[PDB]
Design a protein around this ligand. Structure first.
Ligand code: 8MP
Length: 339
């Protein structure tokens, strides 16, 4: 079996028959986890094991940015700082900040892989304009060059544990005012203006950027469709001008802003037609199941290659071994002293 284009979630801390049915559907390709799916490390390891037992090719992901976005915060998961804290450290000592950024990424990925998780949807590449509250301290820095090298250092730490990465929210959620969970934000800048700054980190990262989530934002001077539903943004810009060949995950189609695509199934079709390789449908598995069964057929061979490449690489240290690893301990001690 090969991965499908739909990333969904499960009902709870243990797998149900309904979960197993959805995980076996051909159009399923991923599971995303939230706080409600975490009781403790043992329970989570058992959950991820049972998910892969149904669909061995499944991709398991989570939102672990640090600060205000980190689903697993207890039973040994290190509470990571808001990425803004690394930009503030950069402003005091550039090189130390890049050293700390890598340690953060290694801790992040190693702890996740010890519970059988493939990837985290990080780093935020939105620029810290101060205009977006929903982004806020999730942004590294104001300067696109600083965001690039800090995000790159983080992705390096992720790579040391065999974990990929996913930059977001393309082409940039940091300038718009509204929160795309609740409304549809707008960004009235010119294409060039957006390219010179907000898009630069995506371009400069090169192969250090493994995937992208596009923003549910309408860039009115470029395309009236939100970036996740926009062939201009996903193909003309990201794949064409930037030559990006990594995976593209839609942002959560359950979000209010994504209602700019119609029903869930119609929004999924539009996102995939625009250039997304996978679509996220969070917090409503039965509605996700309707999407699974109603999704209109499409060419997917190009997408499947990129989805497979998001699986974690190599072996992972289980918790009993990770806790005694000098590198892990070194990262921990550095993160405490540096911040
Ligand atoms: C409102 C700003 C965009 C935003 O914060 N999106 C988050 C939620 N959607 C999907 C995922 O849960 C997560 O990775 C995304 O980053």
């Amino acid at each position: 079996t090969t991965p499908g284009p739909v990333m969904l979630d499960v009902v709870g801390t243990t797998l149900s028959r309904d979960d197993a049915r959805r995980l076996a559907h051909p159009n399923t390709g991923g599971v995303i986890l939230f706080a409600r799916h975490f009781q403790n490390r043992a329970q989570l390891t058992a959950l991820t094991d049972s998910i892969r037992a149904v669909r061995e090719d499944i991709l398991i992901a989570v939102d672990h940015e640090g600060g205000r976005v980190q689903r697993f915060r207890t039973d040994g998961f290190t509470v990571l700082p808001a990425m803004r804290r690394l930009g503030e450290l950069w402003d005091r000592d550039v090189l130390l900040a890049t050293k700390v950024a890598t340690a953060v990424g290694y801790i992040l990925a190693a702890e996740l892989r010890a519970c059988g998780i493939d990837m985290s949807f990080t780093p935020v590449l939105d620029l810290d304009y101060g205009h977006s509250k929903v982004i806020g301290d999730r942004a590294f820095h104001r300067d696109p060059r600083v965001v690039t090298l800090l995000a790159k250092s983080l992705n390096h730490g992720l790579s040391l544990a065999g974990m990929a990465n996913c930059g977001k929210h393309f082409p940039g959620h940091g300038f718009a005012e509204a929160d795309s969970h609740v409304a549809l934000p707008t960004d009235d800048r010119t294409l060039d203006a957006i390219l010179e700054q907000d898009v630069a980190p995506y371009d400069w990262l090169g192969l250090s950027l493994a995937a992208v989530i596009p923003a549910h934002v309408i860039y009115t001077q470029v395309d009236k469709r939100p970036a996740g539903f926009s062939r201009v943004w996903l193909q003309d810009i990201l794949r064409g001008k930037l030559g990006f060949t990594g995976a593209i995950f839609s942002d959560d189609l359950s979000m209010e802003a994504a209602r700019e695509g119609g029903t869930l199934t119609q929004a999924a079709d539009a996102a995939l037609a625009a250039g997304c390789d996978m679509v996220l449908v969070c917090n409503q598995p039965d509605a996700a199941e309707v999407v699974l069964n109603g999704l209109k057929a499409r060419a997917s061979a190009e997408s499947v290659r990129r989805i497979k490449r998001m699986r974690a690489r190599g072996k992972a240290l289980k918790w009993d071994k990770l806790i005694a690893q000098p590198e892990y301990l070194q990262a921990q001690a550095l993160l405490s002293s540096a911040l």
